[PDB]
C-alpha cells in the first residue's frame, strides 16, 4: 500500500472524456497506439470507457478503437491491444476534487498519467504529486 485511498465519486456506467486542467487538453489514444492530448472536443479518439478491476483500480479504454491506456517500463503511455499489467491504474481523488491515475505496476515510484501544457504526455518519472499535469476531470460525452 504505497498510496492513500481517497476515491472519486463518479461511476463507470457511461463513457467520458478525461480533461486535464493543466493545459485544458482531453486525453487521446490514436489508432496507431500514440497517446497525447487535444483541445478538439469533436475528436473521435478522446471518448474513453473506464471499468473497475478491483475497488479503486481501473482500465481506461478507447471506445473508438478498443485499445487500453498503458504505461511502459520507461514511463511512456501507449495504446495496448490487450489488457496486461501495464494497463491498470489506481484511480484516486486529489485536492478534494480531481481524479489522478497512478500506474499500478509502478505505483511505488509514483508514476502518474499526466499531460503537459503543450498537449504532450508527461513520462512517468517526470510526474509527481503536486503537479497540475496529473489532475483530470472526467466529463460526460
From Swiss-Prot:
<keyword id="KW-0964">Secreted</keyword>
<feature type="short sequence motif" description="Nuclear localization signal">
    <location>
        <begin position="13"/>
        <end position="16"/>
    </location>
</feature>
<dbReference type="GO" id="GO:0070374">
    <property type="term" value="P:positive regulation of ERK1 and ERK2 cascade"/>
</dbReference>
<keyword id="KW-0339">Growth factor</keyword>
<dbReference type="GO" id="GO:0051781">
    <property type="term" value="P:positive regulation of cell division"/>
</dbReference>
<dbReference type="GO" id="GO:0030324">
    <property type="term" value="P:lung development"/>
</dbReference>
<dbReference type="GO" id="GO:0050673">
    <property type="term" value="P:epithelial cell proliferation"/>
</dbReference>
<keyword id="KW-0539">Nucleus</keyword>
<dbReference type="GO" id="GO:0050679">
    <property type="term" value="P:positive regulation of epithelial cell proliferation"/>
</dbReference>
<dbReference type="GO" id="GO:0034605">
    <property type="term" value="P:cellular response to heat"/>
</dbReference>
<dbReference type="GO" id="GO:0005104">
    <property type="term" value="F:fibroblast growth factor receptor binding"/>
</dbReference>
<dbReference type="GO" id="GO:0008284">
    <property type="term" value="P:positive regulation of cell population proliferation"/>
</dbReference>
<keyword id="KW-0217">Developmental protein</keyword>
<feature type="region of interest" description="Heparin-binding">
    <location>
        <begin position="116"/>
        <end position="132"/>
    </location>
</feature>
<keyword id="KW-0007">Acetylation</keyword>
<feature type="binding site">
    <location>
        <position position="22"/>
    </location>
    <ligand>
        <name>heparin</name>
    </ligand>
</feature>
<dbReference type="GO" id="GO:0031012">
    <property type="term" value="C:extracellular matrix"/>
</dbReference>
<dbReference type="GO" id="GO:0044548">
    <property type="term" value="F:S100 protein binding"/>
</dbReference>
<dbReference type="GO" id="GO:1903672">
    <property type="term" value="P:positive regulation of sprouting angiogenesis"/>
</dbReference>
<keyword id="KW-0358">Heparin-binding</keyword>
<dbReference type="GO" id="GO:0045542">
    <property type="term" value="P:positive regulation of cholesterol biosynthetic process"/>
</dbReference>
<dbReference type="GO" id="GO:0042060">
    <property type="term" value="P:wound healing"/>
</dbReference>
<dbReference type="GO" id="GO:0005615">
    <property type="term" value="C:extracellular space"/>
</dbReference>
<dbReference type="GO" id="GO:0060681">
    <property type="term" value="P:branch elongation involved in ureteric bud branching"/>
</dbReference>
<dbReference type="GO" id="GO:0009653">
    <property type="term" value="P:anatomical structure morphogenesis"/>
</dbReference>
<comment type="function">
    <text>Plays an important role in the regulation of cell survival, cell division, angiogenesis, cell differentiation and cell migration. Functions as a potent mitogen in vitro. Acts as a ligand for FGFR1 and integrins. Binds to FGFR1 in the presence of heparin leading to FGFR1 dimerization and activation via sequential autophosphorylation on tyrosine residues which act as docking sites for interacting proteins, leading to the activation of several signaling cascades. Binds to integrin ITGAV:ITGB3.</text>
</comment>
<keyword id="KW-0597">Phosphoprotein</keyword>
<dbReference type="InterPro" id="IPR008996">
    <property type="entry name" value="IL1/FGF"/>
</dbReference>
<dbReference type="GO" id="GO:0008543">
    <property type="term" value="P:fibroblast growth factor receptor signaling pathway"/>
</dbReference>
<comment type="similarity">
    <text>Belongs to the heparin-binding growth factors family.</text>
</comment>
<dbReference type="GO" id="GO:0032148">
    <property type="term" value="P:activation of protein kinase B activity"/>
</dbReference>
<keyword id="KW-0963">Cytoplasm</keyword>
<dbReference type="GO" id="GO:0030335">
    <property type="term" value="P:positive regulation of cell migration"/>
</dbReference>
<dbReference type="Pfam" id="PF00167">
    <property type="entry name" value="FGF"/>
</dbReference>
<dbReference type="GO" id="GO:0005938">
    <property type="term" value="C:cell cortex"/>
</dbReference>
<dbReference type="GO" id="GO:0010595">
    <property type="term" value="P:positive regulation of endothelial cell migration"/>
</dbReference>
<keyword id="KW-0037">Angiogenesis</keyword>
<dbReference type="GO" id="GO:0043410">
    <property type="term" value="P:positive regulation of MAPK cascade"/>
</dbReference>
<dbReference type="GO" id="GO:0005737">
    <property type="term" value="C:cytoplasm"/>
</dbReference>
<dbReference type="GO" id="GO:0005829">
    <property type="term" value="C:cytosol"/>
</dbReference>
<comment type="subunit">
    <text>Monomer. Homodimer. Interacts with FGFR1, FGFR2, FGFR3 and FGFR4. Affinity between fibroblast growth factors (FGFs) and their receptors is increased by heparan sulfate glycosaminoglycans that function as coreceptors. Found in a complex with FGFBP1, FGF1 and FGF2. Interacts with FGFBP1. Part of a Cu(2+)-dependent multiprotein aggregate containing FGF1, S100A13 and SYT1. Interacts with SYT1. Interacts with S100A13. Interacts with LRRC59. Interacts with CSNKA, CSNKB and FIBP. While binding with LRRC59, CSNKA and FIBP seem mutually exclusive, CSNKB and FIBP may cooperatively interact with FGF1.</text>
</comment>
<dbReference type="InterPro" id="IPR002209">
    <property type="entry name" value="Fibroblast_GF_fam"/>
</dbReference>
Amino acid at each position: 500500500h504505497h498510496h492513500h485511498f481517497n476515491l472519486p465519486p463518479g461511476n463507470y456506467k457511461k463513457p467520458c472524456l478525461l480533461y486535464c486542467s493543466n493545459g485544458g487538453h482531453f486525453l487521446r489514444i490514436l489508432p496507431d497506439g500514440t497517446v497525447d492530448g487535444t483541445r478538439d472536443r469533436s475528436d473521435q479518439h478522446i471518448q474513453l470507457q473506464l471499468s473497475a478491476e478491483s475497488v479503486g483500480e481501473v482500465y481506461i479504454k478507447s471506445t473508438e478503437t478498443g485499445q487500453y491506456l498503458a504505461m511502459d517500463t520507461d514511463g511512456l503511455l501507449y495504446g495496448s491491444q490487450t489488457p496486461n499489467e501495464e494497463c491498470l491504474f489506481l484511480e484516486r481523488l486529489e485536492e478534494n476534487h480531481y481524479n489522478t491515475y497512478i500506474s499500478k505496476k509502478h505505483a511505488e515510484k509514483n508514476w502518474f498519467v499526466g499531460l503537459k501544457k503543450n498537449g504532450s504526455v508527461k513520462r512517468g518519472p517526470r510526474t509527481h504529486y503536486g503537479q497540475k499535469a496529473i489532475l483530470f476531470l472526467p466529463l460526460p460525452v
